[PDB]
Amino acid sequence: AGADEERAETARLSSFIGAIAIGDLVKSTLGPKGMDKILLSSGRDASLMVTNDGATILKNIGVDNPAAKVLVDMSRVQDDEVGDGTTSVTVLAAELLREAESLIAKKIHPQTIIAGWREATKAARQALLNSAVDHGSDEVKFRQDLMNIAGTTLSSKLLTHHKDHFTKLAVEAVLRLKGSGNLEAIHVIKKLGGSLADSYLDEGFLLDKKIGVNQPKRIENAKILIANTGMDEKEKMKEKVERILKHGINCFINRQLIYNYPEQLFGAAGVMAIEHADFVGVERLALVTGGEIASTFDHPELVKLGSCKLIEEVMIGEDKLIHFSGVALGEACTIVLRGATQQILDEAERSLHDALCVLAQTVKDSRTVYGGGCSEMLMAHAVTQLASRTPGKEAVAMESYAKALRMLPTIIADNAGYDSADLVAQLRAAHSEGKTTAGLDMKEGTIGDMSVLGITESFQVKRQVLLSAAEAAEVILRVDNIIKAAPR
Amino acid sequence: AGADEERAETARLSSFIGAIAIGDLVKSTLGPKGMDKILLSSGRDASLMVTNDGATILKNIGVDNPAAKVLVDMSRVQDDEVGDGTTSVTVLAAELLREAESLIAKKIHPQTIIAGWREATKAARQALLNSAVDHGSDEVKFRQDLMNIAGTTLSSKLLTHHKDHFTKLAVEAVLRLKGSGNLEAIHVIKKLGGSLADSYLDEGFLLDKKIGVNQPKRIENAKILIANTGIEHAEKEKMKEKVERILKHGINCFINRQLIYNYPEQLFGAAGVMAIEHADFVGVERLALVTGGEIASTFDHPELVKLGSCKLIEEVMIGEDKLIHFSGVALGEACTIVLRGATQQILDEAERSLHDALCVLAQTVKDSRTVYGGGCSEMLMAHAVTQLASRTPGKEAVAMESYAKALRMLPTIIADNAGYDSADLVAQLRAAHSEGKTTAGLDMKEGTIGDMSVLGITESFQVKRQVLLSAAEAAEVILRVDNIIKAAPR
Amino acid sequence: AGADEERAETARLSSFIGAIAIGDLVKSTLGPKGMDKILLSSGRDASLMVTNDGATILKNIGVDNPAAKVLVDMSRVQDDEVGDGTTSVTVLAAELLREAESLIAKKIHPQTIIAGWREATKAARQALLNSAVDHGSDEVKFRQDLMNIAGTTLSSKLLTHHKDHFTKLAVEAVLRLKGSGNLEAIHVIKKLGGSLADSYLDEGFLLDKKIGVNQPKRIENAKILIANTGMHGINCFINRQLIYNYPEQLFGAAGVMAIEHADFVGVERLALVTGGEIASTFDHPELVKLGSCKLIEEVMIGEDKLIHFSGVALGEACTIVLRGATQQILDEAERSLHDALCVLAQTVKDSRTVYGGGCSEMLMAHAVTQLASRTPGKEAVAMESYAKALRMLPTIIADNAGYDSADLVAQLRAAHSEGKTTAGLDMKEGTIGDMSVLGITESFQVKRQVLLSAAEAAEVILRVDNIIKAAPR
């Protein structure tokens, strides 16, 4: 009969529906007893991607017309600057929409109500002012380094027995990277095969290619050559050898197909070459080795810089790999993971990417909050009082924000295996008293001292979630429906 | 078949329908509690776009057959000669159409009524030469620099808690700009957080790109090269020509607005030179005024056909993110504003707000005069126009009378977006204007009426001159004609 | 969802429709170019009936289910208290309902909208003192005796080509009638006589009746007898009803002229003139009867014979005979003289007026626009709807004229905002002109009663929240 026509309440509903649909899938994923999800789609999806990381699955795929893709894109900026712990930021933003039902009771102007978000700024600061932080995490630190937040990030994924040990490893990796210039040079891959450790740490960069069956096994005073252009007649062979012998070249890495004639040359010379090396691995390596200029065959000598420690092909345990290590820069390092080997193990690939940005900001912030829901209840006690102080225009919107915090305590306990109702009762009383350390103890079935557990949440996750959620939602709530955008 | 075939009541209606669709959309946008819209299209489009500015969104898409795209097109010329203010002109043109309803009651000849448009020319001249203006503005001005019109554009946006300060900053940018020629060389980008100031002012142009992972970390006494353009052994010659010419200059940086050949990329890193792939053309043109420019041609380009600014080019980090900064411009004509902002998503709306600031201020400095904002101007004129219809003879007057009631809708749109009831607001607004106070207007923050001048909100003189003439001419094309469309197909 | 129940917008519509349905039929009637309609009824009605004036037709029957009958009853009280003029009061009340569509736009409680009516008192004072009024109506009056309201009342009628002259004449009649004594006593009839003057003012009351072929032609020092019940020097006997045959033989020999089935309306006014009668049984002759004795005779005005009563001792009331240029148009003056006189009686008593041709309506409209804005929130929107109602009146006057309505609105407003109360709508001109030159004025009283009458009719919809039923099955 016509084309995309929305009026008063119907348009609001479309924004409203998108937030509720996303929340149900993500809530299971939000804690110690989180759930693993696998998605299967035709064309350029190959098979099933299992993602326990809410951010990764939402950014990758635009399932349908209803708006939510842009909100999802926003979460990624957060990921670079801290990102996770557990994915909770999307859920909290989504629940604000439910209150808009209340807003029709006023029956006047939703934009005016928006002044609540002006006071959201006031509310955002209340979390920052409130809770506390943690006492410890000085820098590096012998044992406060992990068995804390990473374990909680990890707990959602039930690989956490062999895996918590892997989670523990992640901190060591961040300590070397720690400093100005934040996140660079971390690639880490998993290998199929069993070991109790389920992981090895490499001081260098790990690849996975072989020249051929022939060629010297070990290279010394190793020099590295990287060529952008392929090797793909005798004169071409000769140019390469003449430049090569004087240098004493130990390894050649080319990001593409490699022509056969040079291959014979490298073996006799005493030089190990790599065929079709992935470009992304190469770029990281350049920062590591001091870099080099990959022009056509004039590429050797002084146009290139080559680090010279140790390059060798090492059986790590089960599957063969090639190790580049002891780089002069020292800034860039690589992590190698092993596992039980299954859906549960590929989950670790997911978890570590999350692990990688979590501690990246641990270094810069020098601030954190207590975990297990301790942070959320204290703020809720303070925010309830806020609605009364403000003028009535301000009070409705500010009060609505306060009740949102209540759901987080409920989800933590609910996944534990203990009835939610009893849990809510005891929790508020302990926070109201004034103890920041006290929180939800899932293991006990009641409440307990969070600090003894050692569960800590990044301070970084809390500042971005409050401010980002507040105006993101505010733009949509303030605005009464969008038009002349649709495709015909 | 054929084309158009319209006459009688139906013909008037197609024009009538176009005006109503656009007016509601733009209505949300005006004033302090303006509405931001995100646009979804899956017809050769990739993502939802959000445009606060009504003019920008109308320009982007021509959705259907009815006439309206040309009316929309005209508003852009207005933006360069005076800027956006808040979008209001399109709404007034649309309401002209609504009294056509009383026109079917005419039941005789609509064309005689058309005399009103000629009358309108007399009327347009009645406000342009009358109530508006200000006294002062001697060039530069220590305090009269702003705290004015930038604020009204900002007031329409919620961010004016800390943002009114940002607005103050924008005129520093205009004072430096004046000189040599018009508005063009200004670039604005918003950062993601950490400042009370919520902004920083930069010496030169700000860019965000890398050559690749390899290449020197930093350069000094940087020289800038810009190119309009991006047997096997002869390939080597291109490599060599570039190196031979390059070494003598000491070339520290190369900026190219397009794809770049792989061979040169390698060379720049060993030399100590940083190159930029697919640099934005808009960034480049701004950069050219700043560096003294050059003439872009073939590899003959390096030496004195090129002018290089020599202070400092480096990739630097502010607070947390890493950006590349061009600094030390001799010209001073063009500078860049970097907003650190007070970490909020309102900050993400800083880009939205400053862009509006950019067009408004350049015009404000050379127009040398202003009007009172917040709808102060519209209500005053409306009280006066009721009298005007009665002075003219009945054929001319009837069209003139309709034009007068058109101004009435603006008070409602300004207040309605504020969040205070629109009905209540109109009654109190009219009473204060009637008394004789030009300064008095709509105080959206209050929800009632107040003194606009204390706020500092003013409109450029130019916005009022151009819109009054433009509304009348667009309207004339529609009513005088009952059968139209255009030439070419079939 | 079963049977006849209504809420908010749907319930409102039934009230809305009743006002609109009446307006289209009545609008046609207004103006010199007005129209007369014929109607045939379903129960206890013999045939199609045609009524020229709106008040007579509205009154006879309450037909339809929607409410509107109650509104109609009010107009007759207005007619008695002043008269028909040209029907227009009903049209003004109906237009107030149209603004209700934008009423929803205010978006909150329709009942406090009613407080707008409270504001209408402000509007009511506006219709007062900031209008033209008289500034001249001293007594008799050399030029402004007429050429005014009677002419406007007259205009809606077809005959206004020679008739407008007759209408002017009717004020001479009002001046003699003038005073607090018995308003009425004015009767006029047409005569198949000759051209141009089209009417002669004369000596006394005119009546078209005869006793029979046998009876004396003229009586002097006449004695008048009026009896409620059917059948001194007695000269004439006038009875309002059937007269018994036996007395008739007697009257002829005696020298007495009697009138069979004389109209009651002629009789009551005749009584004030003579000095009154106590109309009882045959005991009626002598003192209980008051007679006047100057002269009663049946005379030919210009050709045809009729009976004239004159020389009233009392002097309180007098009558205009008129004459004319042979047609249905001519005896239309019969209806018009009576109409013109009544408006004047109010004019002498009140000693206040205004200017006609819609001059009064446009001036007030310019002033009332200010009032809406001045009043607080809720009061302002309801008050302004009333103000825009006034705008339609200028349009209706012009539309019936056969002249361009759009052009008319602009020029009309143009003359009024200047401050010249004299300028108004001249339909004969086709544009705007000086109303005073025409000489048109409206009585002060007609404007206050119309305002009170229109306001109450509007409230029947609002003072009672609901009237019918909901869902039995």
Side-chain angles (χ1 to χ4, degrees), chain C residues 85-133:
Chain C
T86 60
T87 41
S88 300
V89 310
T90 300
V91 170
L92 283 70
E95 67 190 318
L96 130 300
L97 290 80
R98 283 70 260 212
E99 290 80 10
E101 180 60 22
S102 296
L103 180 61
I104 79 151
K106 80 136 290 73
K107 63 180 180 281
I108 261 240
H109 199 242
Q111 290 89 30
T112 59
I113 300 300
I114 290 18
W117 280 257
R118 182 75 73 80
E119 300 300 300
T121 61
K122 240 280 190 173
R125 75 180 191 86
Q126 296 291 320
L128 300 180
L129 40 280
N130 97 95
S131 70
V133 300

Side-chain angles (χ1 to χ4, degrees), chain B residues 372-373 376-377 380 433 436-442 450-454 457:
Chain B
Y372 290 92
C376 290
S377 299
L380 180 65
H433 288 80
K437 291 180 180 176
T438 61
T439 67
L442 290 310
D451 190 340
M452 181 60 50
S453 184
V454 170
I457 290 164

Side-chain angles (χ1 to χ4, degrees), chain B residues 256-408:
Chain B
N256 190 340
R257 189 254 118 208
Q258 52 187 269
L259 290 310
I260 190 160
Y261 220 20
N262 290 336
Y263 290 76
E265 300 308 293
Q266 310 310 317
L267 180 61
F268 282 90
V273 190
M274 180 180 59
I276 300 170
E277 180 180 270
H278 199 269
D280 290 340
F281 180 90
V282 299
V284 170
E285 290 300 300
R286 290 170 170 80
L287 199 292
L289 231 230
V290 170
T291 178
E294 53 191 76
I295 300 301
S297 332
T298 62
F299 299 97
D300 290 340
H301 60 80
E303 6 120 50
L304 80 320
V305 309
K306 290 281 173 281
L307 280 320
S309 193
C310 51
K311 180 180 180 216
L312 180 60
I313 300 170
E314 64 180 290
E315 180 180 88
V316 131
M317 49 182 170
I318 300 170
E320 73 240 340
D321 240 70
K322 190 180 189 139
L323 297 84
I324 185 170
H325 290 87
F326 180 90
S327 181
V329 43
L331 180 70
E333 185 70 19
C335 290
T336 300
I337 310 143
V338 180
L339 320 150
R340 290 180 185 205
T343 168
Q344 290 170 340
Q345 172 170 340
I346 339 210
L347 180 60
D348 290 340
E349 290 180 310
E351 70 180 346
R352 181 189 307 290
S353 180
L354 192 160
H355 180 70
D356 290 299
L358 178 266
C359 60
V360 170
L361 286 320
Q363 290 301 150
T364 300
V365 300
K366 31 170 70 182
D367 66 346
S368 190
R369 50 200 300 198
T370 58
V371 220
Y372 290 92
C376 290
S377 299
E378 292 95 59
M379 200 276 123
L380 180 65
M381 181 180 60
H383 180 70
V385 290
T386 239
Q387 290 180 160
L388 298 180
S390 70
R391 290 290 190 168
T392 60
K395 290 189 148 319
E396 290 70 30
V398 59
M400 187 180 210
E401 103 220 332
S402 70
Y403 180 91
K405 70 190 190 84
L407 290 310
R408 180 79 300 112

Side-chain angles (χ1 to χ4, degrees), chain A residues 199-469:
Chain A
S199 55
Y200 288 90
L201 190 279
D202 290 340
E203 60 280 339
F205 180 90
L206 180 340
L207 210 228
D208 194 276
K209 290 180 180 64
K210 190 180 189 280
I211 329 107
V213 170
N214 69 90
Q215 260 89 38
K217 182 168 278 56
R218 180 180 290 208
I219 60 170
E220 290 180 280
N221 290 344
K223 299 180 180 313
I224 300 103
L225 193 322
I226 300 170
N228 290 340
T229 178
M231 300 290 280
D232 290 340
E233 180 60 30
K234 298 291 180 183
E235 180 61 10
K236 290 90 180 176
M237 180 69 120
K238 290 180 165 280
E239 70 180 350
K240 297 180 180 172
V241 70
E242 292 300 300
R243 299 290 183 249
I244 290 170
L245 180 61
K246 70 190 190 176
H247 199 216
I249 200 70
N250 292 100
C251 183
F252 180 90
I253 175 170
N254 190 340
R255 186 248 120 203
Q256 53 181 270
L257 290 310
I258 199 160
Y259 193 90
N260 290 336
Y261 284 70
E263 297 300 300
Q264 290 178 90
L265 180 62
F266 282 90
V271 182
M272 180 180 60
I274 300 170
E275 180 256 329
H276 200 270
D278 290 350
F279 181 90
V280 70
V282 170
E283 290 295 297
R284 290 180 190 272
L285 196 286
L287 180 257
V288 170
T289 178
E292 50 187 282
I293 300 310
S295 308
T296 54
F297 300 97
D298 290 340
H299 50 63
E301 34 156 291
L302 280 70
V303 310
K304 292 180 180 345
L305 290 310
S307 61
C308 17
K309 162 60 179 164
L310 180 60
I311 300 170
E312 60 180 289
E313 180 180 270
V314 180
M315 290 180 180
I316 190 160
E318 180 180 350
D319 190 344
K320 42 154 80 239
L321 339 296
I322 190 170
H323 290 82
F324 180 90
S325 60
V327 0
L329 180 70
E331 189 80 70
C333 290
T334 300
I335 300 170
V336 180
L337 300 180
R338 290 180 189 277
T341 298
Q342 63 280 110
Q343 180 180 350
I344 290 170
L345 180 60
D346 290 340
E347 181 164 60
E349 180 180 350
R350 183 200 320 320
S351 180
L352 90 30
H353 186 251
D354 290 339
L356 171 269
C357 261
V358 170
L359 308 194
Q361 290 291 150
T362 300
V363 170
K364 290 300 190 327
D365 64 350
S366 80
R367 291 180 70 178
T368 61
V369 300
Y370 290 91
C374 290
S375 298
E376 290 111 75
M377 204 281 120
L378 180 61
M379 180 180 60
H381 180 66
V383 293
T384 195
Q385 297 300 150
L386 290 170
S388 180
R389 174 173 170 80
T390 64
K393 290 300 310 95
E394 290 170 0
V396 264
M398 190 171 203
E399 70 180 350
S400 62
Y401 180 90
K403 68 190 290 152
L405 282 320
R406 180 68 323 96
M407 180 180 180
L408 290 101
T410 300
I411 190 170
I412 300 305
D414 180 80
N415 63 40
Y418 290 90
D419 190 278
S420 296
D422 180 350
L423 180 282
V424 170
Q426 60 188 340
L427 180 65
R428 290 180 293 198
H431 290 89
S432 291
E433 180 79 70
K435 291 180 180 176
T436 61
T437 69
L440 284 324
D441 190 340
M442 290 180 290
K443 290 170 69 176
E444 189 60 59
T446 51
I447 60 170
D449 190 340
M450 181 60 50
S451 298
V452 170
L453 290 171
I455 300 301
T456 180
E457 291 180 350
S458 292
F459 187 90
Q460 290 291 290
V461 300
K462 299 290 180 193
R463 290 185 290 201
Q464 286 80 347
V465 70
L466 290 170
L467 290 310
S468 180

